Design a protein around this nucleic acid. Sequence first.
DNA 1: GCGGTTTTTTCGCGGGGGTCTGCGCGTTCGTGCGTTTTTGCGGTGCTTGTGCAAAAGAGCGGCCTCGGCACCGGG
Length: 158
Amino acid sequence: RLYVPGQKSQLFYEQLKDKADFDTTSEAIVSFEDILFLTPRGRFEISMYANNLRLRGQSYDYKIQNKNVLRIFSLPRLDDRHHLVILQVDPPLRQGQTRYPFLVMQFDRNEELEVELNLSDEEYKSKYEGKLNRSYGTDSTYKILSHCLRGLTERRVI
DNA sequence: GCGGTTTTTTCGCGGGGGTCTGCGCGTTCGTGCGTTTTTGCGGTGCTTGTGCAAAAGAGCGGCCTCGGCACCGGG
């Protein structure tokens, strides 16, 4: 990864791409950017795969297997403005000494997101039909995330 | 309750610019890592002490017959 300052990186990319005809690719069934975690404290991108969940953070990357997710809680905060999504993980995530058996995410209730799943029509029909929607309309981010987590981990949302 | 005065509430329109907001970088304060000084329950070795086969003679107590006497009744 290069950092090219100035208004310059797009021209640099175009020349390189044209030189060897580089073809862009798309991975991860679904990604959610800029999610606020209360525990661990910080902001994380959540990338979901068939067998595993990735949390990408500026200082810490975590790979959680879908089997290690024991429980999903979807709980409204009493402030009537934020919604909490809570993951119980076993083994608990580690940052050094004390650990994170619970991941606490905080959403705004008014935050809406539109998301298309990165799946082929044959794989969707065979594995995910009736578990996931092919496209989610502009609904609240925490609902889409809770449904995706339910479909991929096969855990009931509490 | 009924009639009076006339204030200031409600109605609408135009213009100004302070406040909200998109965007960026930095930092300071929230959160985890590690520790200080001390409290508490955990156990032991040892101290101090407890409830669980005839034969025979010798000696003895009870006992009984008996000796012998004093006594009642009468004159």
